[PDB]
Design an enzyme around this catalytic site. Structure first.
Site, PDB file in Angstrom:
ATOM      1  N   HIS A  82      -6.064 -49.963 -40.327  1.00  0.00           N
ATOM      2  CA  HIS A  82      -5.910 -49.330 -41.601  1.00  0.00           C
ATOM      3  C   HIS A  82      -6.197 -47.755 -41.116  1.00  0.00           C
ATOM      4  CE1 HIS A  82      -7.160 -48.205 -46.007  1.00  0.00           C
ATOM      5  NE2 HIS A  82      -7.472 -47.273 -45.171  1.00  0.00           N
ATOM      6  N   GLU A  83      -7.255 -47.682 -40.375  1.00  0.00           N
ATOM      7  CA  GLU A  83      -7.651 -46.311 -39.598  1.00  0.00           C
ATOM      8  C   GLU A  83      -6.304 -45.600 -38.880  1.00  0.00           C
ATOM      9  OE1 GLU A  83      -9.486 -44.992 -41.673  1.00  0.00           O
ATOM     10  OE2 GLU A  83     -10.829 -46.964 -41.941  1.00  0.00           O
TER      11      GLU A  83
ATOM     12  N   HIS B 260      -3.401 -44.342 -40.661  1.00  0.00           N
ATOM     13  CA  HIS B 260      -3.421 -43.169 -41.492  1.00  0.00           C
ATOM     14  C   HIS B 260      -2.749 -42.214 -40.459  1.00  0.00           C
ATOM     15  CE1 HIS B 260      -5.568 -43.681 -45.220  1.00  0.00           C
ATOM     16  NE2 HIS B 260      -6.479 -44.427 -44.630  1.00  0.00           N
TER      17      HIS B 260
ATOM     18  N   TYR C 183      -3.013 -36.868 -49.811  1.00  0.00           N
ATOM     19  CA  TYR C 183      -4.057 -37.726 -49.911  1.00  0.00           C
ATOM     20  C   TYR C 183      -4.935 -37.579 -51.458  1.00  0.00           C
ATOM     21  CZ  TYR C 183      -7.649 -41.302 -48.436  1.00  0.00           C
ATOM     22  OH  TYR C 183      -8.350 -42.419 -48.146  1.00  0.00           O
TER      23      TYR C 183
ATOM     24  N   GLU D 274      -3.119 -45.174 -48.778  1.00  0.00           N
ATOM     25  CA  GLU D 274      -4.184 -45.995 -48.878  1.00  0.00           C
ATOM     26  C   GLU D 274      -3.352 -47.350 -48.628  1.00  0.00           C
ATOM     27  OE1 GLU D 274      -7.214 -46.552 -48.636  1.00  0.00           O
ATOM     28  OE2 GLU D 274      -6.924 -44.581 -47.488  1.00  0.00           O
TER      29      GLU D 274
ATOM     30  N   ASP E  99     -12.643 -40.017 -56.137  1.00  0.00           N
ATOM     31  CA  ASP E  99     -12.023 -40.557 -55.252  1.00  0.00           C
ATOM     32  C   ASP E  99     -10.586 -40.158 -55.137  1.00  0.00           C
ATOM     33  OD1 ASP E  99     -11.486 -42.778 -53.106  1.00  0.00           O
ATOM     34  OD2 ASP E  99     -10.267 -44.111 -54.440  1.00  0.00           O
TER      35      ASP E  99
ATOM     36  N   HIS F 201      -8.280 -45.375 -53.446  1.00  0.00           N
ATOM     37  CA  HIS F 201      -8.660 -46.548 -53.106  1.00  0.00           C
ATOM     38  C   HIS F 201      -8.615 -47.499 -54.288  1.00  0.00           C
ATOM     39  CE1 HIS F 201     -10.476 -43.846 -50.035  1.00  0.00           C
ATOM     40  NE2 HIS F 201     -10.097 -44.878 -49.144  1.00  0.00           N
TER      41      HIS F 201
HETATM   42  C1  LIG Z   1     -15.465 -46.819 -50.239  1.00  0.00           C
HETATM   43  C2  LIG Z   1     -14.944 -46.681 -48.732  1.00  0.00           C
HETATM   44  C3  LIG Z   1     -15.595 -47.777 -47.972  1.00  0.00           C
HETATM   45  C4  LIG Z   1     -13.414 -46.687 -48.816  1.00  0.00           C
HETATM   46  N1  LIG Z   1     -12.909 -46.294 -47.270  1.00  0.00           N
HETATM   47  C5  LIG Z   1     -11.691 -47.129 -47.170  1.00  0.00           C
HETATM   48  O1  LIG Z   1     -11.233 -47.841 -47.970  1.00  0.00           O
HETATM   49  C6  LIG Z   1     -11.432 -47.225 -45.476  1.00  0.00           C
HETATM   50  C7  LIG Z   1     -12.321 -48.211 -44.821  1.00  0.00           C
HETATM   51  C8  LIG Z   1     -12.022 -49.648 -45.281  1.00  0.00           C
HETATM   52  C9  LIG Z   1     -10.758 -50.043 -44.820  1.00  0.00           C
HETATM   53  C10 LIG Z   1     -13.301 -50.465 -44.566  1.00  0.00           C
HETATM   54  N2  LIG Z   1     -11.837 -45.802 -45.004  1.00  0.00           N
HETATM   55  P1  LIG Z   1     -10.610 -44.552 -44.981  1.00  0.00           P
HETATM   56  O2  LIG Z   1      -9.702 -44.890 -46.197  1.00  0.00           O
HETATM   57  O3  LIG Z   1     -10.038 -44.328 -43.944  1.00  0.00           O
HETATM   58  C11 LIG Z   1     -11.778 -43.219 -45.629  1.00  0.00           C
HETATM   59  N3  LIG Z   1     -10.917 -42.049 -46.024  1.00  0.00           N
HETATM   60  C12 LIG Z   1     -11.470 -40.758 -45.820  1.00  0.00           C
HETATM   61  O4  LIG Z   1     -12.390 -40.530 -45.565  1.00  0.00           O
HETATM   62  O5  LIG Z   1     -10.519 -39.782 -46.437  1.00  0.00           O
HETATM   63  C13 LIG Z   1     -10.969 -38.341 -46.529  1.00  0.00           C
HETATM   64  C14 LIG Z   1     -10.820 -37.613 -45.399  1.00  0.00           C
HETATM   65  C15 LIG Z   1     -11.568 -37.528 -44.133  1.00  0.00           C
HETATM   66  C16 LIG Z   1     -11.313 -36.728 -43.211  1.00  0.00           C
HETATM   67  C17 LIG Z   1     -10.042 -35.793 -43.222  1.00  0.00           C
HETATM   68  C18 LIG Z   1      -9.295 -35.866 -44.181  1.00  0.00           C
HETATM   69  C19 LIG Z   1      -9.468 -36.628 -45.267  1.00  0.00           C
HETATM   70 ZN   LIG Z   2      -7.730 -45.364 -45.884  1.00  0.00          ZN
END
Ligand SMILES: CC(C)CNC(=O)[C@H](CC(C)C)NP(=O)(O)CNC(=O)OCc1ccccc1
Ligand SMILES: [Zn+2]
Ligand SMILES: [Ca+2]
Ligand SMILES: [Ca+2]
Ligand SMILES: [Ca+2]
Ligand SMILES: [Ca+2]
EC number: 3.4.24.27
Length: 316
Positions: free
Chosen positions: A142-143, A146, A157, A166, A226, A231
Site C-alpha cells: 500500500h505504501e 503511493h 490526496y 487510496e 480525513d 480512507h
Molecule cells: C487510520 C490510518 C491507519 C489510515 N492509514 C492507512 O490506511 C494507511 C496504512 C494502512 C494500510 C495500515 N496509511 P497511508 O494511507 O499511507 C497514511 N497517509 C498519510 O499519512 O497521508 C498524509 C501525508 C503524509 C505525508 C506526506 C503527504 C501526505
Molecule cells: Zn494510503
C-alpha cells in the site's frame, strides 16, 4: 554504502523466519543490492527525524524483537518490487529503478504508516490498535504504491481523486499479498491490526460496510475529515475492484468476475495511461473501461464486467 552483497536471516513481526538481502562493510546493513538501485531500510529510533540511520547489524542475524519491523519492511519492499517488475514490467516506483527507502520505529506508539514524498515510514503501533505496521505485506505494498501513484497519475490526496489514490494503494496492496500467496485475502491490514481481536481488519474490500465504509456512491462522505474521506470513500472503488475480480451481485446488480490478474492489468493501465491528478470516480470508470478495451477489446467480457462493477457501486 559500498560493500559486498550478503544474505542475512531473521524473524519478522509475526515470528516467521526469512532470509534478507544485506550488504557487508564492517557491519551488515539492510541494503539489498539485488533489486534495481537498491532497497534501503533505516532505524528512526522512536524519533521523527527521517530517514534516521541505515540499519546496521554486527552479525547478519536479525532475531531480536527490535529487528522484526526492519526485517519485514525490507523483505516486503523486495516482494513489492518483484511484483511491479515481474507483473507490470515496472522498475521501482519511478519506472527507472529509484532506490527504495524505508524507516521503521518511527515515533512512539505510532498507529500509522505513510509515504512522505521520498520514502516509506512505519510506526510500531501502540500494541492495541496496531503492532508494527511493516508486518503487513498489504500495508508495505500500500505504501510503496503511493509512490507509484505519485510518479504516474499523481492523484491529489483529497476528495474523489484522493479516494481513488487510496483505493489504488489498497488494490495493489492486496494484489501483492496474493502474489506472495501467504494467507491472502481482500481485507486490509489484518496481520497487524488489533492484536487483541481476531478476524477483523482496518478495511474490507469485499464488504467495506462491515467497518462503516461506503460500498455505493450514494453513501459517499462529503465532509472535511480525513482529507474529505480518502480512507472512507475508497470503499466505493475497493468494492468495484473486488467485484471486477471476484464477481457478485451487489444492490441487485450482477457482476461477472474476471480474476485478479486482469483486474491488476486494467487498473495498472488506468493508473499509468489514463488517470490524472484531478480524476474523479466517473473519470476512473471511463479510464478503466478504456484500459479494458485496449487490453481485451470493446466486445470483451472484461469490458462488460468493468461496466457492471461500476454500475453496482453507483458510479456512472
Ligand atoms: C487510520 C490510518 C491507519 C489510515 N492509514 C492507512 O490506511 C494507511 C496504512 C494502512 C494500510 C495500515 N496509511 P497511508 O494511507 O499511507 C497514511 N497517509 C498519510 O499519512 O497521508 C498524509 C501525508 C503524509 C505525508 C506526506 C503527504 C501526505
Ligand atoms: Zn494510503
Ligand atoms: Ca544481529
Ligand atoms: Ca492476509
Ligand atoms: Ca490483506
Ligand atoms: Ca485484529
Amino acid at each position: 554504502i559500498t560493500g559486498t552483497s550478503t544474505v542475512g536471516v531473521g524473524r519478522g513481526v509475526l515470528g516467521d523466519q526469512k532470509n534478507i538481502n544485506t550488504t557487508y562493510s564492517t557491519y551488515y546493513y539492510l541494503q539489498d543490492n539485488t533489486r534495481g538501485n537498491g532497497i534501503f531500510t533505516y532505524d528512526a529510533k522512536y524519533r521523527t527525524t527521517l530517514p534516521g540511520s541505515l540499519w546496521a547489524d554486527a552479525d547478519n542475524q536479525f532475531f531480536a524483537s527490535y529487528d522484526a519491523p526492519a526485517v519485514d519492511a525490507h523483505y516486503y519492499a523486495g516482494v513489492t518490487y518483484d511484483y511491479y517488475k515481474n507483473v507490470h514490467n515496472r522498475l521501482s516506483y519511478d519506472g527507472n529503478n529509484a532506490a527504495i527507502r524505508s524507516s521503521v520505529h518511527y515515533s512512539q506508539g505510532y498507529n500509522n504508516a505513510f509515504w512522505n514524498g521520498s520514502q516509506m515510514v512505519y510506526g510500531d503501533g501502540d500494541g492495541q490498535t496496531f503492532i508494527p505496521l511493516s508486518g503487513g505485506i498489504d500495508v508495505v505494498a500500500h505504501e510503496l504504491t503511493h509512490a507509484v501513484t505519485d510518479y504516474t497519475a499523481g492523484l491529489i490526496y483529497q476528495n474523489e481523486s484522493g479516494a481513488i489514490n487510496e483505493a489504488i494503494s489498497d488494490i495493489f496492496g492486496t494484489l501483492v499479498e496474493f502474489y506472495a500467496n501467504k494467507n491472502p485475502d481482500w481485507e486490509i491490514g489484518e496481520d497487524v491490526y488489533t492484536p487483541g481481536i481476531s478476524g477483523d481488519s482496518l478495511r474490507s474490500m469485499s464488504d467495506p460496510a462491515k467497518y462503516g465504509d461506503p460500498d455505493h456512491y450514494s453513501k459517499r462522505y462529503t465532509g472535511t475529515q480525513d482529507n474529505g474521506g480518502v480512507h472512507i470513500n475508497s470503499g466505493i472503488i475497493n468494492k468495484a475492484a473486488y467485484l471486477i475480480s471476484q464477481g457478485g451481485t451487489h444492490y441487485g446488480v450482477s457482476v461477472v468476475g474476471i480474476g485478479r490478474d486482469k483486474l491488476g492489468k486494467i487498473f495498472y493501465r488506468a493508473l499509468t495511461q489514463y488517470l490524472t491528478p484531478t480524476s474523479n470516480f466517473s473519470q476512473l470508470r471511463a479510464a478503466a473501461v478504456q484500459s479494458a478495451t485496449d487490453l481485451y477489446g470493446s466486445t470483451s467480457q472484461e469490458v462488460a464486467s468493468v461496466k457492471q462493477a461500476f454500475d453496482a457501486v453507483g458510479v456512472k
